[PDB]
Amino acid sequence: TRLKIVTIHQEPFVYVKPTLSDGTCKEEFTVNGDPVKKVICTGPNDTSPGSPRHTVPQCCYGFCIDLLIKLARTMNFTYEVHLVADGKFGTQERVNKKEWNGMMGELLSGQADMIVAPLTINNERAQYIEFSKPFKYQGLTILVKKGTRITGINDPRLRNPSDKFIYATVKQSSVDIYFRRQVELSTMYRHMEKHNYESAAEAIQAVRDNKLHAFIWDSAVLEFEASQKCDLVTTGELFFRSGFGIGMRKDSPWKQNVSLSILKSHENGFMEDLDKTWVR
C-alpha cells in the first residue's frame, strides 16, 4: 500500500530543515526559477547518543527526495518519509548474534519498506538486502582544511599515524565497513575507530574548527562541501570507487520496476538534470 521511506540527513542528497509554525515547508525556488519540491519527513531532533528521541515533522528536499518523487509518480505508489531513528547508514555489529543498525536495521525490521538515500552498495549489505542498479557512481576521498598538505590515502601521516594528525570517518557507515574489512588498512582503521564521528556534518564542522585534520568520506558529498565552503578542500582523487543505490527487502514487489526506472532516468538525462540541480 503506502511505502514507509527511510532517509538520512546528507547534503546535498537530503536537506533537513524545521517546518514553519503552521507545520508546512518554506516555499523555495532554484536559481532556475523552478519550485523546490519538499516532503514532510518525521524524525528526532535531540541527536544526543543514549538519549530519548522525540519525533517531530521536519522538511526534506534534495537529489534523493526528487528521485523519490519520480519513482513514486512512475510506479504509482504513495509514501511517508521518516529520518533514520539512530542517524546512521548501517553496519552489522556483533551483539553470539549479529545485528544491523541504521537504515539497514530499519529496512530489515520492517520500520521502513525502502531506503532512499546516498546508500553505498557493498557486499556486506547486498547479502541481506536488494540494491537497485546505481543512481550515482562516486568514491572515497579525503577532506582537509585549506593549507593541510596530505598527498592522499598513501600519505605517511595516514599510513603511519600519531595523535598529532587526527583523521576519521562516520561511525556505522560503509566507509567504516571498508576500513574494518581490508587488513591492508587496519593501521588506519585502528586510528579512525578512536576518533570517528556520529554524522558527516559533525565531522565536516570538526575539520573547520581545526579539531579534525582529515575526514575520509564520500566524494559526492565532500566535493559538494568543498565547492560551498572555500576554507575546505579535498585531497587527491578517489582511492576507492563506489555507487549509491535504492535499498529494498529481497522480497519487495517493487524491486524490478525501481531498477528499470533508475535506468530510464539515467538514459533520458533525468539523473544528469538532478546532478546539475543539486550537485554541479
Partner: protein, 279 residues
Amino acid sequence: DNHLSIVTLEEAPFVIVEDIDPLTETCVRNTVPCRKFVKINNSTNEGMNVKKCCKGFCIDILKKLSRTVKFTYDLYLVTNGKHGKKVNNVWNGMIGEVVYQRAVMAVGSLTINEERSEVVDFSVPFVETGISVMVSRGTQVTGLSDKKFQRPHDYSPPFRFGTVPNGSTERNIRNNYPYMHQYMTKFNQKGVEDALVSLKTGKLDAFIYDAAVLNYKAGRDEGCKLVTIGSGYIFATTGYGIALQKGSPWKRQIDLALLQFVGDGEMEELETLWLTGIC
C-alpha cells in the same frame, strides 16, 4: 549442473581473441578456450566450431567468477549479431543468446540498459560506462546537447559525426535525439578501428560511442591526439554487466562475488592490468 554455456564477443581490451597454439594446439598463459562457429560457405547452414583462445579484462573477471562461484564453462563467441539489438521484436547478439537460453550468461563489454533489462537480468556493474564523444584535441563541443549535434544543418559545412550502429549507443541516440540520429546514419562506422582512422585522417569530426572503450582508446592514442570531450565526460552513465536469464539461480552468488572483487582491490588490479594508458 555447474557446467555453463557462456557467450562472449571480441572487443579489446575487455575481450581479445587469439589463434590456438601451433605446437600445443591448446590455450596457454592468461588465455582460456573459446569456440567460434564458422560457416563452410554461404550456400549452406553447415559450419564448424573453430577452437580459439580468449583473454582480456572480462575474461579475468570470468576466471575469478568460475573459481569463487564454483562453476566450469564452455565459452563461445556470438555469431548472430553483436552485443544485442531487438530486430522485429527478436533479440540477437549476446542478449539474444541469453533470452533464447543458448547461454546461461553473457560475459563481455555488455552495456546495461532498460530495454535489455526487460528481457534479461543484469549483475551489478563491474565497469562504469555510458556514452562519450571522441574528438581531435581542442575540438569545441560542449557535449551531446551541443547545437553542432542537435541541429547539425545549422552549420556550414555541417559537423561530421557517427557511431557504430546496432548497439546501446545508437539506441540511446535514437530514443533521445531523433533529428541527430537520422542525420548521423550516413556517418555509421563499421567498427571502432574504422572510426579512429576516419577521425585521425579528418573524415569525421566526432565519434560517439561506449565510454569505457573510448577512454581506453584515448589513453593509447599515438601522439595523444584523440580525446574524449570534458574531463572524460559520460552521458547516460551505466555499466557493463553480466547478462543472465530472468530468475537465474546464479545471479545472487555472481553479484556477491563481483562486489567482493570490488571491495578487495581485485577489480582495481584488473583495471591497472588491462585499461590504463599513457595519455
